[PDB]
């Protein structure tokens, strides 16, 4: 059994309503437990565990460390967000819809899309289905694309049309894929 | 805790096992880039993000500080080793499975701690070395990690695939089977 | 270029 000691540092930036609410949380973790952190709302280092207390007092006493950290909200978060607005926040990936039976089951495969925000509805001859429809949690592919599988318990008969309505921020008009029995 | 967009500038990791280290920048749970500490160069995951130039010296200096911080915490905690957690392995396809059409197999390994894991692909018992790519150790809210492994495919009915995951938290190597059906 | 948050050294070591 090999023994291992892990140390982590996370310079976390939080953004709400664009630039209206900006928060910085600098976390120091050892191993899975956070020992000391710096929050932008308090403007000073505060220990989470007893192990973080000698570090917190050492950094709060030093003027140079405290100065840089209190300015990091505009230097790291607010500056990097301006770079994100024309890069990652501008990224729009068109979703691909596919209907395949599984027939008592019918699954609507919405794959390869960005950002994460998505709303997918099931229809049976212009009437929306809510009771017999199960959705998988928003699956993260990791390569800056998402996928979501939405199944529907259906009892088909002649003349029935099953429409999968999909809404995404990258689309002006929703994509609708139909299936006939 | 609650925000529209959550970013990490950046995820700093250092462990005494290798001694291996990792430096990444995350945005909404997606890896923007990783700094190759050996080759001393920034490797971006998105082509649009390559217009910016991140200095690799930033990561190397942060690792040197994380090396100093890890040794100081081992002495303070009286050599408190990291608890080995049981990882969750799940295998799925990037797009709907079509025999003869190119697809990508994804092996999601969640709740990894300590971040030491060997992920290898196997086809009908034979180990696969061609068409494999892995993402960096992506951080989690509970300060644990998750890694994603990719495999370029051309699905066939007779061709079976398995994802071999080697972790200390597991009693035996976990193999998650995938059938094209 | 993205500006990162810098970790500071731990006393004692």
């Amino acid at each position, epitope marked *: 059994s090999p023994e291992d000691f892990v140390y982590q540092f996370k310079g976390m930036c939080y953004f709400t309503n664009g630039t209206e609410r900006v928060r910085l949380v600098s976390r120091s973790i050892y191993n899975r437990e956070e020992i000391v952190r710096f929050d932008s709302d308090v403007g000073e280092f505060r220990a989470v565990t007893l192990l973080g207390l000698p570090a917190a007092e050492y950094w709060n006493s030093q003027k140079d460390i405290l100065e840089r950290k209190r300015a990091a909200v505009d*230097r790291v978060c607010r500056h990097n967000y301006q770079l994100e607005l024309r890069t990652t926040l501008q990224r729009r990936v068109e979703p691909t819809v596919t209907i395949s039976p599984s027939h008592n089951l019918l699954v609507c495969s919405v794959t390869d899309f960005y950002p994460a925000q998505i709303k997918v509805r099931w229809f049976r001859n212009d009437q929306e289905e809510t009771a017999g429809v199960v959705s998988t949690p928003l699956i993260r592919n990791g390569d800056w694309t998402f996928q979501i599988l939405v199944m529907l318990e259906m009892t088909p008969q002649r003349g029935d049309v099953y429409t999968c309505h999909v809404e995404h921020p990258s689309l002006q008009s929703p994509i609708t894929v139909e299936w006939r029995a | 805790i609650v925000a529209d967009h959550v970013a990490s500038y950046g995820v700093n990791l250092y462990q005494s096992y290798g001694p291996s280290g990792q430096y990444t920048h995350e945005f909404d749970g997606d890896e923007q880039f990783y700094v190759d500490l050996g080759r001393k160069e920034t490797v971006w995951c998105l082509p649009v993000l390559r217009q910016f130039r991140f200095d690799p010296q*930033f990561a190397l200096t942060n690792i040197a*500080v994380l*090396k*100093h911080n890890l040794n100081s915490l081992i002495k303070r905690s009286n050599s408190t080793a990291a608890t080995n957690e049981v990882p969750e392995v799940t295998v799925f396809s990037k797009s709907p499975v079509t025999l003869g059409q190119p697809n990508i197999l994804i092996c999601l390994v969640d709740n990894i701690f300590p971040p030491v894991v060997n992920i290898t692909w196997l086809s009908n018992g034979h180990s696969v070395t061609e068409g494999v790519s892995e993402t960096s150790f992506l951080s989690k809210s509970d300060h644990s990690f998750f890694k994603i492994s990719y495999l370029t495919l051309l699905p066939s009915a007779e061709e079976s695939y398995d994802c071999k995951v080697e972790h200390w938290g597991l009693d035996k190597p976990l193999l998650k089977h995938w059938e094209p059906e | 270029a993205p*500006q990162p948050e810098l970790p500071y050294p731990q*006393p004692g070591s």
Partner: T-cell receptor
Amino acid sequence: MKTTQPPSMDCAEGRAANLPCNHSTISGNEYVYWYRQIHSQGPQYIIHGLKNNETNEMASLIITEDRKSSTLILPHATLRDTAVYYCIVWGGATNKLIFGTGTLLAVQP
Amino acid sequence: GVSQSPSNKVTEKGKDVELRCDPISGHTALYWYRQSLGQGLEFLIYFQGNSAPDKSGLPSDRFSAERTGGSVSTLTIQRTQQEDSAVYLCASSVRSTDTQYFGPGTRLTVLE
């Protein structure tokens, strides 16, 4: 980003010394640092700022709203203040002290 | 206050010199600079703890620096030449990209 400042400035002793600095190509994550050097002696740190005005025991720094300009104020200028003043932009990858031409301020007795 | 020893050094060409620098208490980053009369600050090498991330800046293979401590750093110049004559300044900060405070310097003169 780079800084441009006058080569030399003559100021009377006792009067406040205002040293200008131009940095129009500056970014939001960059600081406005000020250093001085008496002949060939070791460079001395004075003050630094990011957004607004800063006040130190040694001098005062006034950064404009547009951040395209900055001014260093030495309230009681003495003969000991006769040095070459460097206005440097520090931010991002910047880890090396790069001195420009500077302003050499000669306080006049 | 950053300390530097010796204050001045007069040597012959081909001789080896050892320049010492003691930084401020708590400062983990050390910086080595070179300065000539009527010219700007020339970067040589810098340390972060005990390791040197940027080896570039050194004029030749003759120039070397060590910080085994890793607190006090020594800059060695073997087989000194007339062109190596300059004021060697040492700077320190709590860690990299932080406010640098300089020492008194070391005036070096190499003669034929």
